[PDB]
């Protein structure tokens, strides 16, 4: 396989437009695979990338959520082959390092997250066709591009009868929330759960809590449209903070839990002040908070009195989901329809219309946006 | 028993002197006991009280650490009787509430910490003899006084052959650190531990970690005098941050742990910036931090990137030690000499010389100060 010429969405400067460019995609080197994208999606992490956060690397092809088919492989691709359906991964799972051997973490020492925007050898496989200028990728694999190249340890081969839109959603937020309910804290039968923020992450928490038999599942969101979505996934109670401007969120949760708070609180907004509220909403002595959302600031402040309260604060990436061990189990639940993801899909666009996605995500009835591709002939 | 006239150390205003006053101590009411103090001690929490933190309640008799003998009892004193040796408690253990039934917490719903400086009925048992002016107590029992009155649920009857100085030290810091090594995080055989701050709290952590079979126990302190004390209690490695002003504490710990950090880090200084360092010094994915020390500020800041690191942050009061279930076991280890506390005792004063304690605590060779009392005739 030679160099492929295709289209990709490129951002050239912080807060600049995302524009369609003709690019070249080099063939995969050793331990790489080249993927034809089947569909993609978008979350807040992609928006941050267009503003140069965390690292301003430009020009850049955004996108980390999606699914594709292997078009070609380098040497030593660990059994991957053309025609396999794969989803890109945030981090790998070597199964042999000190962290993998514990069974207690998904934070593999050997395949950790990357922030370089480049392949393992410090070069890019993607370049502007007109100039040859090198383009940074996003995370371990750009998905807003007709073709991408990834390290074989950062893709997961998946069952080919999973729907591609649903696999795209399981490559990030819903899986993060769903997995957190047994990998980061053990939601048990009869326990109480509160979920701050009812986007795809919070909907994953809600469904995970429901499948674990939580008997009270409180969703909190300022967007009233989210209440019906939460109910579909198992939410038992809804709080809109804007209905009570003189009450704190933790006060409102305690009102539903006999003044005690919940066993497990999941922070799925990223709003910095809501970390403190999540802690105050969980039970003294036996409550756990998992802060999934990110606020993008330098540090986050915790009321110093919470340090005496016996609560457990469990830090977390990708919901504690191990990407080779646990992620296939979640996909299988989707295949077997134990989880139903159709209600996540609210909007569809094609890649040429990528700029419209940044307006669509502001709409109150948006949950997940699907990005579709055209075929070359 | 009538009203007792005795001496007590009183602070009249924030940052004022601590002065000996003649006071009156009323007899115990229902569910109270009156105690003759045998000895007392001092920690930073008492210093804060003289500066009006957390609540400026004056006039006040400071002191929460000590041991005494019951002089008289109210009705319904739950089996306590004159002549019992008791230590005052920060919080009780009812054994029947939702939190007590879990076995997972010492934060009893029925006997929580008090901040009122007053008895359960909103009055004081202590007053200035010359005026009758009411005096606030400290915590659940003032100890810088020849006689005190406490709610019977906030004292623990102890074995009368325990040494009174050692029991005084076990009423607070050493017990907090020691208990944290199995109640808040489970230090296991062969694990690594780092301890920031080697006062009585950190020395308790070190000894608890040693008894649990931790194979590396790193003590961190800017006071070089503490290194020898740490070694007596089981410390294997010592770091003085001042020896490397261009390296962070977490960097120095990682240098001793193959770049990984420790399984369990205990923050025993209260220095706000050291909470972040404790987290960075613990292992990604599988490390736990217990922040025991208090900084007395409104909030504490955590580097936002730590929220992705898989670490566990376990909040805590009194080291997770349940005051009726776990505290007697710790006392018994002291009786059976499995823990040796003689090295804690560095300075002794009598109550009349209480003002000198605030200078003694600044001395680099101070660990614990014992406060002694005279008898009335
Ligand atoms: N862990 C991941 O994979 C991932 C991916 C993208 C973004 N994030 C961070 O995690 C959060 C959740 O991700 P998402 O895809 O589900 O985002 P989302 O935007 O779809 O959901 C966020 C929800 O929080 C609600 N919300 C915002 N502010 C609120 C407030 N002050 N009080 C109550 N509700 C509020 C919004 O209405 C929205 O429904 C994001 O807000 C962002 O901070 C995490
Ligand atoms: N949990 C409790 O029961 C309790 C009681 C009193 C005070 N406190 C808080 O907990 C801390 C520990 O209590 P303690 O009785 O053992 O206090 P302590 O003062 O006897 O010990 C604190 C030790 O930390 C060291 N230290 C201070 N700043 C440091 C720095 N920047 N880097 C490295 N070492 C530093 C000091 O040298 C000292 O050896 C106190 O500092 C205070 O914040 C807790
Ligand atoms: Na590679
Ligand atoms: Na396609
Ligand atoms: Na998002
Ligand atoms: Na996040
Ligand atoms: Na009482
Ligand atoms: Na005495
Ligand atoms: Na102290
Ligand atoms: Na403390
Ligand atoms: Zn995402
Ligand atoms: Zn690994
Ligand atoms: Zn103390
Ligand atoms: Zn109780």
């Amino acid at each position: 396989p030679g160099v492929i010429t295709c289209k990709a969405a490129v951002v050239w400067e912080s807060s600049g437009p995302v524009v369609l460019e003709e690019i070249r995609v080099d063939p995969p080197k050793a331990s790489e695979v080249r993927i034809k994208m089947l569909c993609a999606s978008l979350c807040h992490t992609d928006v941050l990338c267009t503003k140069g956060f965390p690292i301003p690397l430009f020009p850049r092809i955004p996108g980390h959520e999606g699914v594709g088919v292997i078009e070609s492989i380098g040497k030593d691709a660990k059994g991957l082959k053309p025609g396999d359906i794969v989803m890109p991964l945030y981090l790998g799972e070597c199964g042999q390092c000190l962290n993998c051997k514990t069974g207690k973490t998904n934070l593999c020492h050997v395949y950790p997250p990357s922030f370089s925007g480049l392949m393992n050898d410090g070069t890019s496989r993607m370049s502007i066709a007109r100039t040859g200028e090198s383009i940074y990728h996003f995370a371990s694999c750009s998905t807003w591009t007709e073709y991408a190249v990834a390290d074989c340890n950062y893709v997961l081969k998946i069952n080919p009868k999973i729907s591609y839109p649903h696999a795209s959603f399981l490559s990030c937020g819903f899986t993060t929330g769903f997995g957190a309910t047994w990998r980061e804290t053990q939601v048990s039968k009869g326990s109480s759960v509160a979920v701050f923020g009812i986007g795809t992450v919070g909907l994953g928490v809600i469904k995970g809590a429901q499948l674990q038999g939580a008997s009270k599942i409180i969703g909190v969101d300022v967007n009233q449209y989210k209440a019906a979505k939460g109910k579909v996934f198992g939410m038992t109670d809804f709080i809109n903070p804007k209905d009570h401007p003189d009450k704190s969120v933790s006060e409102l949760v305690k009102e539903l839990t006999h003044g005690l708070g919940v066993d497990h609180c999941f922070e799925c907004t990223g709003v910095p002040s809501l970390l403190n509220e999540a802690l105050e909403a969980s039970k003294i002595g036996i409550g756990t908070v998992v802060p999934i959302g990110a606020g993008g600031e330098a540090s986050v402040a915790i009321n110093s009195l919470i340090l005496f309260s016996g609560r457990t604060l469990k830090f977390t990436a990708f919901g504690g989901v191990r990407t080779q061990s646990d992620l296939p189990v979640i996909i299988d639940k989707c295949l077997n329809k134990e989880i139903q993801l159709d209600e996540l899909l609210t909007h569809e666009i094609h890649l040429d219309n990528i700029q419209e996605a940044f307006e669509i995500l502001k709409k109150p009835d948006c949950v997940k946006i699907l990005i579709k591709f055209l075929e070359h002939h």
Side-chain angles (χ1 to χ4, degrees), chain A:
Chain A
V3 181
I4 289 182
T5 305
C6 70
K7 298 165 189 59
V10 174
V11 57
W12 291 89
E13 55 175 347
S14 321
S15 297
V18 178
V19 296
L20 270 291
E21 304 285 354
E22 187 170 75
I23 68 159
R24 313 268 303 294
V25 184
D26 290 340
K29 299 192 189 162
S31 303
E32 298 170 353
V33 302
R34 187 162 62 182
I35 300 157
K36 174 165 145 268
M37 213 70 55
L38 296 168
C39 50
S41 188
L42 174 158
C43 81
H44 182 67
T45 301
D46 299 307
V47 177
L48 294 179
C49 154
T50 68
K51 303 167 180 307
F53 304 97
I55 314 185
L57 298 165
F58 299 96
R60 193 155 206 185
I61 294 165
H64 57 288
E65 306 181 1
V67 61
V69 55
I70 295 190
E71 170 271 345
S72 59
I73 63 172
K75 287 313 159 225
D76 296 318
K78 299 200 180 177
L80 298 173
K81 68 184 185 303
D84 290 346
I85 308 303
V86 294
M87 80 169 55
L89 300 176
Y90 177 61
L91 65 179
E93 179 184 349
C94 80
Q96 292 295 325
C97 71
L98 291 170
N99 263 6
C100 283
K101 290 220 155 102
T102 70
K104 303 164 124 193
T105 179
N106 60 334
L107 300 184
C108 177
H109 291 159
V110 175
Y111 303 123
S114 184
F115 301 115
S116 69
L118 299 162
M119 302 314 284
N120 196 279
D121 64 8
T123 71
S124 176
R125 304 282 166 272
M126 295 185 302
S127 59
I128 299 280
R130 154 183 269 279
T131 63
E133 176 168 7
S134 175
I135 304 167
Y136 292 101
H137 72 238
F138 191 69
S140 302
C141 193
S142 295
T143 63
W144 296 1
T145 171
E146 294 179 327
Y147 287 82
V149 180
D151 182 308
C152 69
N153 299 291
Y154 292 82
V155 310
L156 172 68
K157 179 187 164 191
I158 62 176
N159 188 317
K161 47 216 187 203
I162 196 86
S163 95
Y164 303 151
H166 294 178
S168 295
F169 303 156
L170 292 170
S171 73
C172 186
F174 187 92
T175 292
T176 293
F178 186 84
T181 64
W182 88 89
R183 297 294 306 168
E184 301 291 16
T185 179
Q186 292 75 50
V187 173
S188 66
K189 188 172 192 280
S191 65
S192 56
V193 169
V195 187
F196 292 7
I198 313 187
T200 189
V201 174
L203 296 170
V205 178
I206 289 168
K207 185 58 177 181
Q210 184 228 54
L211 291 185
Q212 306 278 339
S215 57
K216 194 189 309 273
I217 302 170
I218 302 163
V220 187
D221 209 297
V222 294
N223 179 2
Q224 194 71 28
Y225 283 73
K226 289 307 178 64
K229 294 286 184 181
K231 175 154 171 274
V232 161
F233 287 88
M235 186 184 71
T236 64
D237 295 87
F238 180 70
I239 298 172
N240 187 329
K242 290 188 313 216
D243 295 347
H244 311 273
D246 273 7
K247 284 184 179 172
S248 71
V249 174
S250 60
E251 273 186 86
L252 299 162
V253 172
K254 286 193 257 178
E255 292 179 352
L256 300 179
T257 52
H258 303 110
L260 295 164
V262 295
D263 296 302
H264 316 276
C265 189
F266 300 80
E267 206 306 290
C268 308
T269 73
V271 175
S273 64
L274 283 185
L275 171 63
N276 211 70
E277 282 309 308
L279 284 157
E280 301 280 8
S282 67
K283 290 177 181 175
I284 294 163
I286 64 174
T288 301
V289 169
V290 179
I292 299 171
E297 303 190 327
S299 69
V300 58
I302 291 168
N303 185 328
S304 298
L305 295 176
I306 293 171
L307 269 60
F308 306 111
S309 69
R311 296 169 172 119
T312 297
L313 184 57
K314 181 60 172 72
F315 304 131
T316 172
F318 200 59
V321 173
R322 299 169 298 167
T323 49
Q324 301 284 344
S325 295
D326 300 323
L327 188 42
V329 172
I330 293 171
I331 292 160
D332 273 350
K333 291 186 182 274
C334 176
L335 268 166
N336 304 337
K337 299 164 163 226
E338 309 159 45
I339 69 186
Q340 316 90 40
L341 301 174
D342 283 338
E343 292 263 6
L344 298 183
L345 176 45
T346 59
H347 296 82
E348 277 178 28
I349 66 168
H350 36 70
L351 190 67
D352 288 327
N353 198 33
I354 183 67
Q355 192 72 57
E356 171 79 347
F358 296 92
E359 299 311 304
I360 294 179
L361 57 85
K362 309 177 178 174
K363 298 301 162 278
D365 59 340
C366 180
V367 181
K368 287 303 288 180
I369 303 165
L370 179 67
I371 296 163
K372 292 188 93 23
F373 299 82
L374 279 184
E375 309 278 277
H376 315 190
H377 302 285

